[PDB]
């Protein structure tokens, strides 16, 4: 019974909640990454009644967050063109508004947090 040692994934971790004929594994990324495509393997039979595993290892990469959000009457600073889990950027108005909240913006999880505004 059961299927053979399921396949693995780089920069990711499997969630083997069962390896029985008809079970399913849950694929996930390591940390600060983003798994693309599927995320679950299915223990099934091959073509000649053999043992195999359905879609196991999907995609996985480090959350590359480009230029921070595009606020109104303002913009971001940054020195590079891309960012990842652990990047920061300072925001600034254009015409000359008043940076609302904090100019700093954390880059983590393929997104940005703590974005400011620009009011008079």
From Swiss-Prot:
Segments forming domain Sushi: 1-62, 63-120
Cystine crosslinks: 3-43, 29-60, 65-107, 93-118
Sorted UniProt keywords: Disulfide bond, Host cell membrane, Host membrane, Host-virus interaction, Inhibition of host complement factors by virus, Membrane, Repeat, Secreted, Signal, Sushi, Viral immunoevasion, Virion
Subcellular locations according to the entry: Virion membrane; Host cell membrane; Secreted
Gene Ontology CC annotation, any one: membrane
Main localization category: virion
GO terms for biological process, alphabetical: negative regulation of complement activation; symbiont-mediated suppression of host complement activation
GO molecular function: complement binding
Family that this chain belongs to: Belongs to the receptors of complement activation (RCA) family.
Subunit architecture: Heterodimer with A56 protein; disulfide-linked.
Purpose: Serves to protect the virus against complement attack by inhibiting both classical and alternative pathways of complement activation. Binds C3b and C4b.
UniProt name for this protein: Complement control protein C3
